[PDB]
Every structure is written in C-alpha cells, then in structure tokens.
C-alpha cells in the first residue's frame, strides 16, 4: 500500500525535526507542526511510484551558535545497506564540507558496513538509526525524565563544588536510547531533572562511559 507509506514518512519526518531541534540546531517553527495533509501536498501524495522517492526527503540544518557546522540526514533506498553506498554519502559529505551526518536505515545494515563506519573516527562522524525507532518520540514518554547536556565549563564546576573526581559519578553507557537521541560521546556529563514527592525536585548527574 501507500497510505500506510505516506503516513510513516510524515511521522518519521516530524520526529527528526524535533531530534535536531533538541541538539540545538535551527528548525523553522511551522516545520515542527507540519500536519499530514500539508506534507501530502508538498512532497507528493504517495511514494509508491510517486514523487517522494525516499530522496527529496533529506534534511540539511545549521547550528544556532554557528552557521558553519551543519548536519545532514540520509534516507537510504535499499532495505539493507552495502559498502560503497555509504561511500556515496561519504563522497557527498566530502564535496559539501559537512561532518555531522545521519542515515535513517530502512530495515538493517551489513556487518561489513558496520566496519566501514567505525574507521573514520577523526572526521565524518555518522549516526546509524533504524526506521522503526524514529516512529515515536521516546523523550515525551511518561517515565523518561528531562535530560540536558552540560558544557565542558559547567562540568568543571561540579567536580570543584562537591570536591569530586569524575570517576565517582553515576554512569550511563552510550548505547541506550537516550544516549543516542542526544548524540553523546564518552567523557560528557548529562543532567537529569526529575520531580519527587519528598522534596519536590531533584537534580542528578550521569557520566557517559
């Protein structure tokens, strides 16, 4: 069918326009509440033999604090992705001078491709997702509290106020759904703000390792 397919592509799009807004990028206001029929009229009624090809959907955004650092997102066409197919993208980043990139994998990837992304460490950092996971914003769930990432100037204020080291904090591994939603690397500290019934509000910290 295509009605299921024109629905998903609108939903997955609406999710990403918030994911990049959380990371501190600049997204126009009406792009956040783009209703279905508006999406159906702009990009095309159906992707089955239609104008929406899973390309013409890609997004390029620029940061708020700096117009140079930009982020790209790709929507591969094949169910599972090969080797040069990402190098097609690696070339597309090489030409446009963009390092931040995402790929919305459709159904899976190959173990060879798993090797092909962990190599370019100092340059061309890419994040691999799944089509299914982006269908719902987990950040707006009930159980999930509010996370905020702290600059590297604030982190040195904790460890000097509570006279701590950085080994003595509670830890979080960079493989759980909210560690990736925010694009977190090892050595960063994230701040959790949850309300409790004894005090009213409690702020805890996590070290991502």
């Amino acid at each position: 069918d295509d009605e299921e397919e024109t629905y998903r592509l609108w939903k997955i799009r609406k999710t990403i326009m918030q994911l990049c807004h959380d990371r501190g990028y600049l997204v126009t206001q009406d792009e956040l509440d783009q209703t279905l029929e508006e999406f159906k009229a702009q990009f095309g009624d159906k992707p089955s033999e239609g104008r929406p090809r899973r390309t013409d959907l890609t997004v390029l955004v620029a940061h708020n604090d700096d117009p140079t650092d930009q982020m790209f997102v790709f929507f591969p066409e094949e169910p599972k992705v090969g080797i040069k197919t990402i190098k097609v993208y690696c070339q597309r980043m090489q030409e446009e001078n963009i390092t931040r990139a995402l790929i919305v994998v459709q159904q899976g990837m190959t173990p060879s491709a798993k090797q092909s992304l962990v190599d370019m460490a100092p340059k061309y950092i890419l994040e691999q997702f799944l089509q299914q996971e982006l269908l719902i914003n987990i950040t707006e769930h009930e159980l999930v509290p509010e996370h905020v990432v702290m600059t590297k100037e604030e982190v040195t204020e904790l460890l000097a106020r509570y006279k701590l080291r950085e080994n003595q904090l509670p830890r979080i591994q960079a493989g759980d759904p909210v560690a990736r939603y925010f694009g977190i690397k090892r050595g960063q500290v994230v701040k959790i703000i949850r309300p409790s019934e004894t005090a009213g509000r409690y702020i805890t910290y996590r070290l991502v390792q």
Partner: protein
C-alpha cells in the same frame, strides 16, 4: 493480522482512580474519566507503540529488560520503583520512600542491569578479600 507474539488481548474499562483519565477542568478541578484500556498476554512493545490511535506516552509493559532495550536506563529505574511500590502496597501495607529510592538507585548505578545474584555481585571494582568470602576463594586469590 496483529503482532506475532501477543496471543490474547482483553478489554475493560476500570472503576478505580488508578487507571482512569484525570483531567484538570476549566474551573481548575480534578475530574476523573472512565476510558477503555487493553491488556495483552505477550510483549513486543516497540511495534505496539508504533501503531495508530494507540497512546505512545502512557503505554508500558511489566517486563523491564524490554524497557531497558527500548526506552533506556532511567525508564528502568522508574519502572522498577513503580513495580516495587505496587507489590508492597498490595495488602494495604506501607513502606517509606527513601528505602525504595536507595535500592532502585544502587541497583542501576553502573549503567547496566546487574541483578542482585551470584554473578551480579561477582562483577564490581571490589577487593580480593571479599570475593574470597564467596565460594571461589582459592582461584581468585591465586589470580591476585
């Protein structure tokens, strides 16, 4: 039709204020509303959440490894706390909050779910003379 693993799905609307839909009215009063809820026997939540006309916020599962893989680590903390509270307050009893908080905080402190078990205690940055008090004295002390 349906998802492969979920076999039987029931249907009822509650009468308690536990599963009702509490809204704040225009006069600023708490009003409870009866709403249909569904309960299954079998879990694959990542797909059930992705479907249409299903609330993606308040839907949850009573298995916590699934929430760990799907939702994160803080969600595991809060779900574990909620289930402990529900099993304690089943027969009208009561236990203070600090104890639940401390337990469900020291249980999910090193990032991943380590059970309070034999080989869940076996792994932490602990000394050699404590793992000798647990059934593998000689080999770990020879390693040391």
């Amino acid at each position: 039709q349906g998802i492969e693993q979920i076999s039987k799905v029931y249907m009822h609307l509650p009468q308690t204020d536990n599963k009702k839909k509490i809204i704040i009215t225009e006069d600023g009063e708490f009003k409870a509303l009866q709403e249909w809820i569904l309960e299954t026997d079998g879990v694959s939540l990542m797909r059930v959440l992705s479907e249409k006309d299903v609330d993606p916020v308040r839907t949850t599962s009573n298995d916590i490894v699934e929430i760990f893989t799907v939702l994160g680590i803080e969600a595991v903390r809060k779900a574990l706390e909620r289930e402990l509270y529900h099993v304690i307050s089943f027969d009208g009893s009561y236990v203070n909050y600090r104890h639940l908080a401390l337990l469900c905080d020291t249980m999910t402190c090193r990032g991943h779910l380590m059970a309070i078990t034999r080989h869940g205690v076996n792994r932490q940055d602990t000394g050699p003379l404590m793992k000798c008090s647990f059934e593998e004295t000689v080999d770990v002390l020879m390693e040391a």
